[PDB]
Design a protein around this ligand. Sequence first.
Ligand code: MG
Ligand code: MG
Ligand code: MG
Ligand code: MG
Ligand code: MG
Ligand code: MG
Ligand code: MG
Ligand code: MG
Ligand code: MG
Ligand code: MG
Ligand code: MG
Ligand code: MG
Ligand code: MG
Lengths: 156, 80, 199, 131, 135
Amino acid sequence: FEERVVTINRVAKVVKGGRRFRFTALVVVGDKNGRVGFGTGKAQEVPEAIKKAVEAAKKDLVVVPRVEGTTPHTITGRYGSGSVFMKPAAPGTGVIAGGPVRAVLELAGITDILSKSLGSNTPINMVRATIDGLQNLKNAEDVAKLRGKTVEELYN
Amino acid sequence: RNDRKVYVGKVVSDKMDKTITVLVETYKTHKLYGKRVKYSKKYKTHDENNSAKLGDIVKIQETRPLSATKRFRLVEIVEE
Amino acid sequence: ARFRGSNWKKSRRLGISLSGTGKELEKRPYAPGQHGPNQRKKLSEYGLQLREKQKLRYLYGMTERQFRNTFDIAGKKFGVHGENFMILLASRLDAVVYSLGLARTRRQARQLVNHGHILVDGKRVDIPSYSVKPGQTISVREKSQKLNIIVESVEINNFVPEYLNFDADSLTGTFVRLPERSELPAEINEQLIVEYYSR
Amino acid sequence: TMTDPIADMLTRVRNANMVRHEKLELPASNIKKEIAEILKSEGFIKNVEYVEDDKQGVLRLFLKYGQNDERVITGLKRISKPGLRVYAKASEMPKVLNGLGIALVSTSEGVITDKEARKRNVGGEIIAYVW
Amino acid sequence: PTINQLVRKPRQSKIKKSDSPALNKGFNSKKKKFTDLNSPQKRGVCTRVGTMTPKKPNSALRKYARVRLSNNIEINAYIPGIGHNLQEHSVVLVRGGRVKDLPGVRYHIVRGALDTSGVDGRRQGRSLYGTKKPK
RNA sequence: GUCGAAGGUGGGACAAAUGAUUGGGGUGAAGUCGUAACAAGGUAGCCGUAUCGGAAGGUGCGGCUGGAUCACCUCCUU
RNA sequence: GUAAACGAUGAGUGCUAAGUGUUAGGGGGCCCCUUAGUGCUGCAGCUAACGCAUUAAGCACUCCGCCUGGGGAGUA
RNA sequence: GUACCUAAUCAGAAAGCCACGGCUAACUACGUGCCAGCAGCCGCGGUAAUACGUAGGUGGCAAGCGUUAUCCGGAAUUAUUGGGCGUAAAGCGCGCGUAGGCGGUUUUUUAAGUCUGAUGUGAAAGCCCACGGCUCAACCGUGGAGGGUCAUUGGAAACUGGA
RNA sequence: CUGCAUUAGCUAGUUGGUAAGGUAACGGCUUACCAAGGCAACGAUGCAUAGCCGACCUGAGAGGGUGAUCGGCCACACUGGA
Ligand SMILES: [Mg+2]
Ligand SMILES: [Mg+2]
Ligand SMILES: [Mg+2]
Ligand SMILES: [Mg+2]
Ligand SMILES: [Mg+2]
Ligand SMILES: [Mg+2]
Ligand SMILES: [Mg+2]
Ligand SMILES: [Mg+2]
Ligand SMILES: [Mg+2]
Ligand SMILES: [Mg+2]
Ligand SMILES: [Mg+2]
Ligand SMILES: [Mg+2]
Ligand SMILES: [Mg+2]
């Protein structure tokens, strides 16, 4: 499992004297073979925050349906104000994505796709929107089975 | 040989002597939003015998200029 | 060549042997400059994409404008954009001469073609940018058939890729077919350069 | 008052599918019945029954759920609306979900799916998307 | 909005303002009028030359000139660099670009153009201050 | 002789510039006077309206909760 | 002819778990069903969150009114 | 007597601009000390300044490099595609009602919208695809494709429109 | 094929008919007579701005901006009339 640190943020809690600072790390973990997940970790130092984030991500993984390095169909993943539109591309196109979305897609194993963040650009909600889209993605075989037909019948 | 444009429309005024104005109704689509919207164009046509009357659906055909603004001639009264 | 600079410093910056020997990286594999040693910073995504683009560009000894134009015309070919760009870079007369081995260095082959010691299909070609195509032949000027540099480079029996068929008795090479990604150097991730020019 | 019976039918189907209901009774019409038959043929619903009673009759749909209680219908969308009607050519016929969905169309040759519209090389009013 | 509402009253985009209005106007003397023309610089005459105090938290004596432009518009232009040779009646070239510290200063005076001299003793970024190559 | 450009005369319309003087507005540095609001902000605040007062503002009438609160009864929810 | 003229929530229509009050009725045996209001609690769903939730701020269609950074200013 | 070709001589005549705090590739030393100055935004500068000026080094470009002006983009920030209106900007204080917009179920008919075929035209140049000619390229040339809410005409009747 | 309603009324050869004159030509194009018509919230009228197009820039597209060079069409030639 490859892991990428999306963002590291220094948050503060106010106390009677001074402030208590912590580091929150958001991390994406993926096998580059259709499995990807994300996690958050809070610690007094960034290495420990990263380690906890990695553990959480490994705990929480999703399976991404693919077709020759691209998603099966267009989808708009939404979480909160986050919103990420994603569209299958052709080989050689690359991953046209910015910010956390590129990390999530690369670690999920997608190599050719077009995308656009249409909503909030806060990294955690961008990642959650991307994961929502990838979860909602559907595959030809599963939808043929659900509809009680064959792939050939499905495509006529 | 070559024929001239013919339109069908309702008569909306005939107070002019031997001239009736025919209202041809069309539906142009909005160029951006694509909705169907009504479009009316009034045609000044020649009515030699004052046969057409306010209300009847008539047919007109394009002619040479017959007046300052008359360009059409009444062919037949489709309905009344 | 057009870029007359410290090719060793460039190899050290980019982490690649532009000559291919490795002499530049053998002793000091770190970046030039006062802060070269003990350099430990981590490149960003943009930095990595830029470093890969610069690796390819300085490997082929091209300028930024021409490099971008080549990338643009390659994009218009059918197939994988990065592979098309790499093969088009390889098809340049400089690369073809260097692979045939008429010179030991890419800059030396560039200077040869610039000064007109080479002929394509039996006609002079002064422009290193010339794009060779399959079925063509590269020769050497008769007045320069006995140049010390050329004859020494020919003596040194370098490897000749599959897409080139060379005869060192006549100093004649033939561009048989278009290259392939494997044939072309593997130390470059063309997807990184495609993404760089995407943004 | 009521202004789009097709919209209303699709919204009834959507609400029932969300709540995971089994059957669904709505007022009937020829267009609704053809839409329901197309859905049954394509496999999005289990069964369709028509009650030929007074007051225009009733349509009784029976929805289809797959294994693990998964929903066969992901979503239904009204395309052409009373406020703005949408038509498409044969060469411009849209593919829902890269082909994994259907676009119900109304054509001179009866209301059919987008696949049949493309096959017969016809266009018409794009009634709805279903996937 | 409804489609009918859009059709009745179509959408209207926000209009964009120029950051350098004084450069967008020329003056025709014969017709004694203004004319709309986009210019990258304008000649002017320094009506005043002096210093201004920046707004907080910054503190300094920033050098500026009040300039009448060829189109008869009077503007405040900042003088960049260290040291300048400008006085009243100096003819100067003015370009866009405001100084955030100075409230009413919305233009810059080009260095090394018309009367304005290059910055003496400048060696890096010399083109930005109109200084010749020392060699 | 008709038509007829320009010109002349006249009362109006419209636009721009400019004008003694005058009005509020914005910005600005440690300016002066008080302390309206934010806690029940020390008279809960705010909205409309009226009048008064250096100034914020005060006061009256109706309205709102986007109001804190100790004791009381009146119901409603788990 | 203006109010914090407020539910700070336009009108019409249909659809989507439930529990429990109260106002004016109706049908079937203190109980059940039902219509129209008026309240509280609470699923799915929605929402930035708070919360709304058959009296939606859910799912849809029609039409209308309105918004596009804060001042300047509801001023000229 | 220009392009071009041939013969001889010399590395000898031919590199500058901007940037290096984040965005953004590139860091150190001196001088200064809220001054001088910088600045697209956030900001920097009061003795340890990678942000001011110089020097070394580095980065990006290169016979160009920077600045200013203007347009589109990023901006889904006028949202048809593709946004909203309880508290962030936004439901008129509320009726009655005109025009307009929209409209329940079935049958027959028309063919205005809608769909489909043919013909004519949408000049040339341009853009895109292919080929050819300048040593390459720009460029030039030649074919193709594209571009109408286009017009005439022949067909279909589910939906919207008419009877 | 353009902006404004903080421009809502405009029009009297004006709209139509008859006759004549006039023109390469039909025609209120002009004149005599008769009538009161004509345009307009589907934006008349007024004001402001502007040569139009093939095309050019940008944008994934939809769109947005522009109308140099080259080609077509139009208009003008110190200002106005002939
Ligand atoms: Mg959690
Ligand atoms: Mg107080
Ligand atoms: Mg108080
Ligand atoms: Mg008092
Ligand atoms: Mg209100
Ligand atoms: Mg009730
Ligand atoms: Mg836009
Ligand atoms: Mg508000
Ligand atoms: Mg209300
Ligand atoms: Mg009010
Ligand atoms: Mg053409
Ligand atoms: Mg003009
Ligand atoms: Mg866009």
